[PDB]
Design a protein around this nucleic acid. Structure first.
Ligand SMILES: [K+]
Ligand SMILES: [K+]
Ligand SMILES: [K+]
Ligand SMILES: [K+]
Ligand SMILES: [K+]
Ligand SMILES: [K+]
Ligand SMILES: [K+]
Ligand SMILES: [K+]
Ligand SMILES: [K+]
Ligand SMILES: [K+]
Ligand SMILES: [K+]
Ligand SMILES: [K+]
Ligand SMILES: [K+]
Ligand SMILES: [K+]
Ligand SMILES: [K+]
Ligand SMILES: [K+]
Ligand SMILES: [K+]
Ligand SMILES: [K+]
Ligand SMILES: [K+]
Ligand SMILES: [K+]
Ligand SMILES: [K+]
Ligand SMILES: [K+]
Ligand SMILES: [K+]
Ligand SMILES: [K+]
Ligand SMILES: [K+]
Ligand SMILES: [K+]
Ligand SMILES: [Mg+2]
Ligand SMILES: [Mg+2]
Ligand SMILES: [Mg+2]
Ligand SMILES: [Mg+2]
Ligand SMILES: [Mg+2]
Ligand SMILES: [Mg+2]
Ligand SMILES: [Mg+2]
Ligand SMILES: [Mg+2]
Ligand SMILES: [Mg+2]
Ligand SMILES: [Mg+2]
Ligand SMILES: [Mg+2]
Ligand SMILES: [Mg+2]
Ligand SMILES: [Mg+2]
Ligand SMILES: [Mg+2]
Ligand SMILES: [Mg+2]
Ligand SMILES: [Mg+2]
Ligand SMILES: [Mg+2]
Ligand SMILES: [Mg+2]
Ligand SMILES: [Mg+2]
Ligand SMILES: [Mg+2]
Ligand SMILES: [Mg+2]
Ligand SMILES: [Mg+2]
Ligand SMILES: [Mg+2]
Ligand SMILES: [Mg+2]
Ligand SMILES: [Mg+2]
Ligand SMILES: [Mg+2]
Ligand SMILES: [Mg+2]
Ligand SMILES: [Mg+2]
Ligand SMILES: [Mg+2]
Ligand SMILES: [Mg+2]
Ligand SMILES: [Mg+2]
Ligand SMILES: [Mg+2]
Ligand SMILES: [Mg+2]
Ligand SMILES: [Mg+2]
Ligand SMILES: [Mg+2]
Ligand SMILES: [Mg+2]
Ligand SMILES: [Mg+2]
Ligand SMILES: [Zn+2]
Lengths: 114, 206, 122, 53, 125
RNA sequence: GGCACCUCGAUGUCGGCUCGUCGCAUCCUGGGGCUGUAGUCGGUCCCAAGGGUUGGGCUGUUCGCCCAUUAAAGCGGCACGCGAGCUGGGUUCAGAACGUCGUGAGACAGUUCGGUCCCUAUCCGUCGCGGGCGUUGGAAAUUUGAGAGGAGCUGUCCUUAGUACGAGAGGACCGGGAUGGACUUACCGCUGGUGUACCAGUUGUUCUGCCAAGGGCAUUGCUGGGUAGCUAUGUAGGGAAGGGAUAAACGCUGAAAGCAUCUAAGUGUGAAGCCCACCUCAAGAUGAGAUUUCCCAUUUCUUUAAGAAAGUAAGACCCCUGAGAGAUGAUCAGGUAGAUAGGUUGGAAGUGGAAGGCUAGUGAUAGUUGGAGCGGACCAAUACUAAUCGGUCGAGGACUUAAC
RNA sequence: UCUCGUUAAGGAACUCGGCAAAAUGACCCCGUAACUUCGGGAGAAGGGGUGCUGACUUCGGUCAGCCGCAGUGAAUAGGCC
RNA sequence: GGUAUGAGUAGCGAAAGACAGGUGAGAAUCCUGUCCACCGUAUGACUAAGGUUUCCUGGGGAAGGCUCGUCCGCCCAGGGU
RNA sequence: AUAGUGAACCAGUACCGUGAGGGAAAGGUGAAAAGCACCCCGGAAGGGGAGUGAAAUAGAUCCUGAAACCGUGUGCCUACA
């Protein structure tokens, strides 16, 4: 553990804002369609945070054009310019898998303003 | 090129250009050449390498005498490496992870994790019989063979002890070499439980 | 992961509403198809006024799946449903409009017309 | 499945080669001198590691 | 890991609570090897809670220690009854205030007649 | 089909499932000759068995038709391989009915619904794992490789090049790349699964005297998550290059036979095949191999004995703590010359805000104290507990003949 | 091997046959087809509600608020066409 | 009729026990205590049949009890309607 | 005494069967009990002595005491077949 931790500490980002499942974040994802590179904003609710150290990931869920879409990112990926916290949600559990079954008004999360 | 280390564990690393790749951490505290074998004496050329200093009370007079020529403490793992430039090696010389460079293509050998007595489904990837429709044939190894020989042919695969086998993974990529930590990062996964002996050699197919 | 008898929503206005996978193309024993793979399918439910109609054997490209896809940056994408677009032999969509988001993996398979038509490419 | 042939005296004896008891780990109690199982309390004097327990 | 001791989880938890309290009350008991090697951790985790001495620790211990009489004395009257839980926090807790772990020892004894089961003595200190 | 030779003090019958294995009269892939072979596709014959050789609809079916694929979707043998391995739909046991035949009981020259599949493996065989002794002094490691096993498949796209070829249409050989299918070896960092002494929510009832806080039972009561471990559907890798001898085939030079001729001498090319190359096992390889290192020539009695016996040496084990190992043995990590396990103290994963208070509210409840409390297996420290004390076993090395 | 619990994506592709399992399941309310011997078919089907706390009641509700992923929060009570 | 082989093998008949103390030559198995657990339209309380001494008390441990046994619906001696 | 009655012995018994009915096994210390006082190990069983006896390897499962079967000692042989 300590040795693997030391090998990877160099690549941990330090610009991670404090966010937890249920918060709404805007993820600034770098996309490449060829030579050019671009930022595509994926905004939605964090439904999952798992792992530790360099292997930590999180999942953001949004409903686009009627279809639920989940994106999982490595927390420390350089391919994400910025993780922006839009709103703080009030939830009661670490994993928000139950939102997958809900839609529209039922899937709403109350803001808490941390 | 070759070295002996211990399997520390698996993690992941971001490369340049942002790709995420799994790596296995192999820690190889410098190995010591204990003996050089030549055609003149042994009939074949090889170097005998020692890794992982061992406490004195865990060693023997025969073992302590063997490593005396190299002038080192007792070593837990002793292996031979063939097809090298013997003249470039001598007893007591140290081999460090910096022998390998990032981007080198290697072969990694280890002892697969033990699994104990296992059935032919897990051990040999065989197919179950149906689980319903009156079936009383679920995890059994299949017909032992035709009637005519009045016997079972060899290599009829059955249950038995699984794992604990030498396995070599070929054409793995060395991702990083942290010499101050005596650590080599290998892309992908390799055989063996954590803390088990791992042998890194330059890829034979290269 | 789409296999024979797997049923998918239709993400276009070709006329078909639901298809059933007849074949995963691309090899003798291939069992599974994922986003960007082409399947042979039957139309099980069709819009009454549509061009493609019930009972027709069609080819289609998977554009979203519950088991989505992994990208090289260690990120993943998953969708809430399995949807396909009916294509002609040259990969052009049979219909005129694509519905719902589409995986970016269609680009590297060169389904450009679908990608250009999709309201969103994630 | 039933025995096709009865097992001979010799064959039965050979099978029972490894059917035996062993008496391992007896040494003298350091307190009373009677034999005892190592790492066990002496059943005679009740001592262990030089102490009454 | 943890031994299953030939019981179901609920049966095993009941037995560990029974034997753990037996040890708290008697401070010396005879059991089989397997049970002793499991009780040594449960009993010393109870002692750790007793050393904490706070209400939260008391209530955690209360979920495991049985509701059994640990002693009766004439300290003030002939009706001073102390529970297993109270001995844990009144007596045993302060007893091991300065020992850091290792509140029990196991002494291997003879096997049991009807079983050949390897018996031991598990006791405090 | 013929015969009636083994079996009627019983050799279980179709199809399917599981497991394959072999032949080659080869389905695919590899090599080649002829072509009524322009090219691209083909035809036909030769060599070739290394690997590969799909999933569905109908039917008990085999077969076959069909759908959709595929490089292909080969043909056969193995008691039409495989029922002490499975299935039991079909094969008319007893029931019942239809058509039909019969005066009839009944029956089929036919159909229909329903109908008990036993066996604790002794031996050989097979797959794993130990003990013994051997290997010629006794030990601890490292090894060579006799021999054996595994692996062996293939698509598509780009480039050469719209070039050679062709009136057009179409459209290459060889060479160079990329990327897949199937299969397969490992592994759990990732995505997921599981996770019955991890966390939370919640129902009924019951117990801890009551409140509060908790325990028990209800499938782990149910529900939502989830660590280690084990895992795929997840991840990584693999069948890469290359030699040698050949098949069909093609020669070269060359005579018999002034010519011709691949052959007779001589000499070459030539396949996914053979032997290597790659992976694994491997000297019980009784032919018992080699190398490095350690112990070192003891005592007594018999005796010229390769004597018997006794302490030991190097060393190993008993026993004990264990795990990365495991049915048990075994293996490996340790035994105070100590971190081997437990505990303890810090962490972490995980859960998601403990209890006790306080504030608000009529209240359910919310906020706060405070990312709190809890926290199996994960990490790091720490001799607090237990690995105490001891015992057993284990050499003194034959002879003959070279040489030195 | 048996008995039991959970399973990614798919969802009968299994198989002689959905065998087995899964799912349905209580109560209240809305609603309920062909056909019929007019009784039935029906519990057809297909839907909604269910906890807690106050206020208010024509005593069945109504209004309001509150908590959870989920309120016949466990157990036991049709799968349908 | 005796005795083998298979074997020291199958099996030991649907479920929770734990510890302290006692008794004793000897106890996982007998007694006592404590907590725990199981049945409770019952695994409770009666009673007909059937059995026919199995009831009680004191002793016993050959056999019977699928292990053990100091215990028993067993054995011995007394009694009981 | 596997004969001879089914029954030499508490046999038409035990045992089986609702019943009719079926139906066993089982003889031998010694001349005489002189049936091993007493001692020792053991809770007992059982042994070892000491005795009785011509003999107890005649000790009541008692004359003789075969074979299968089970074991102990060891002269020779056996771990490349
Ligand atoms: K002692
Ligand atoms: K026959
Ligand atoms: K075959
Ligand atoms: K040809
Ligand atoms: K072949
Ligand atoms: K079929
Ligand atoms: K069928
Ligand atoms: K046959
Ligand atoms: K059968
Ligand atoms: K057979
Ligand atoms: K045999
Ligand atoms: K409760
Ligand atoms: K209970
Ligand atoms: K889980
Ligand atoms: K050898
Ligand atoms: K609180
Ligand atoms: K926490
Ligand atoms: K299927
Ligand atoms: K109906
Ligand atoms: K609700
Ligand atoms: K019902
Ligand atoms: K017998
Ligand atoms: K036997
Ligand atoms: K008694
Ligand atoms: K006599
Ligand atoms: K003998
Ligand atoms: Mg976390
Ligand atoms: Mg299968
Ligand atoms: Mg079964
Ligand atoms: Mg043969
Ligand atoms: Mg329970
Ligand atoms: Mg108790
Ligand atoms: Mg004849
Ligand atoms: Mg016969
Ligand atoms: Mg041929
Ligand atoms: Mg058979
Ligand atoms: Mg007639
Ligand atoms: Mg006929
Ligand atoms: Mg039926
Ligand atoms: Mg994993
Ligand atoms: Mg992990
Ligand atoms: Mg309360
Ligand atoms: Mg450690
Ligand atoms: Mg599933
Ligand atoms: Mg699912
Ligand atoms: Mg089917
Ligand atoms: Mg089928
Ligand atoms: Mg059913
Ligand atoms: Mg309920
Ligand atoms: Mg057997
Ligand atoms: Mg029982
Ligand atoms: Mg109950
Ligand atoms: Mg009831
Ligand atoms: Mg009585
Ligand atoms: Mg009595
Ligand atoms: Mg008994
Ligand atoms: Mg007679
Ligand atoms: Mg006679
Ligand atoms: Mg008679
Ligand atoms: Mg005599
Ligand atoms: Mg006699
Ligand atoms: Mg030989
Ligand atoms: Mg020999
Ligand atoms: Zn002693």
């Amino acid at each position: 553990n300590p040795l693997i931790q030391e090998l990877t500490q160099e690549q941990l980002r330090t610009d991670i804002p404090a966010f937890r499942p249920g918060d709404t974040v805007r993820v600034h994802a770098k996309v490449v369609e060829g030579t050019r590179e671009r930022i595509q904003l994926f905004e939605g609710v964090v439904i999952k945070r798992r792992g530790a150290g360099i292997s930590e990931t999180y999942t953001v869920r949004k409903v686009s054009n009627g279809v639920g879409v989940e994106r999982t990112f490595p927390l420390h990926t350089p391919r994400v310019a910025q993780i922006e916290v839009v709103r703080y949600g009030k939830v009661r559990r670490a994993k928000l898998y139950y939102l997958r079954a809900l839609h529209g008004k039922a899937a709403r999360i109350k803001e808490i303003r941390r | 090129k070759g070295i002996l280390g211990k399997k520390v564990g698996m993690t992941q690393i971001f490369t340049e250009s942002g790709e995420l790749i799994p790596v296995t951490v192999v820690e190889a505290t410098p190995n010591v050449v204990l003996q050089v074998k030549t055609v003149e004496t042994d009939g074949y050329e090889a170097i005998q390498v020692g890794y992982q200093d061992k406490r004195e009370v865990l060693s023997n007079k025969p073992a302590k005498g063997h490593v005396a020529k190299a002038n080192t403490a007792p070593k837990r793992f002793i292996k031979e490496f063939k097809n090298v430039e013997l003249g470039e090696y001598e007893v007591g010389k140290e081999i460090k992870v910096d022998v390998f460079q990032a981007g080198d293509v290697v072969d990694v050998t280890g002892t697969t994790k033990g699994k104990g007595f296992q059935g032919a489904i897990k051990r040999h990837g065989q197919s179950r019989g149906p689980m319903s429709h009156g079936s009383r044939y679920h995890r059994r190894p299949g017909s032992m063979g035709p009637v005519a020989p009045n016997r079972v042919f060899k290599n009829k695969r059955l249950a038995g002890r699984m794992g604990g086998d030498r396995v070599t993974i070929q054409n793995l990529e060395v991702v990083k070499v942290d010499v101050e930590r005596n650590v080599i990062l290998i892309k992908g996964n390799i055989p063996g439980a954590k803390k088990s002996l791992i042998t890194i050699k330059s890829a034979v197919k290269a | 992961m789409i296999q024979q008898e797997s049923r998918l929503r239709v993400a276009d206005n070709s006329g078909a509403r639901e298809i059933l996978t007849i074949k995963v193309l691309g090899g003798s024993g291939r069992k599974t198809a994922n986003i960007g793979d082409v399947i042979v399918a039957t139309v099980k439910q069709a819009t009454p006024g549509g061009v493609v109609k019930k009972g027709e054997v069609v080819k289609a490209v998977i554009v979203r799946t519950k088991s989505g896809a992994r990208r090289a940056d260690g990120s993943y994408i998953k969708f809430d449903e399995n949807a396909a677009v009916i294509i002609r032999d040259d990969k052009s969509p049979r219909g005129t409009r694509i519905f719902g988001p589409v995986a970016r993996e269609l680009r590297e398979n060169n389904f450009m017309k679908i990608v250009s038509l999709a309201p969103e490419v994630l | 499945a039933v025995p096709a042939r009865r097992t001979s005296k010799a064959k039965k004896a050979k099978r029972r080669t490894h059917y035996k008891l062993t008496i391992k780990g007896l040494n003298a109690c350091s307190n009373c001198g009677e034999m005892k199982k190592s790492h066990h309390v002496c059943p005679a004097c009740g001592h262990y590691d030089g102490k009454d327990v | 890991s943890y031994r299953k001791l030939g019981r179901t989880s609920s049966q095993r938890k009941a037995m560990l609570r029974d034997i753990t309290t037996d040890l708290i009350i008697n401070e010396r008991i005879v059991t089989t090897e397997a049970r002793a090697k499991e009780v040594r951790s449960t009993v010393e985790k109870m002692i750790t809670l007793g050393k904490r001495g706070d209400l939260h620790a008391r209530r955690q211990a209360a979920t495991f220690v049985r509701n059994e009489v640990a002693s009766v004395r004439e300290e003030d009257e002939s009706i001073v009854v102390e529970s297993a839980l109270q001995k844990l926090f009144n007596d045993l807790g302060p007893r091991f205030a300065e020992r850091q772990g290792g509140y029990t020892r196991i002494l291997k004894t003879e096997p049991r007649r009807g079983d050949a089961a390897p018996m031991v003595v598990i006791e405090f200190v």
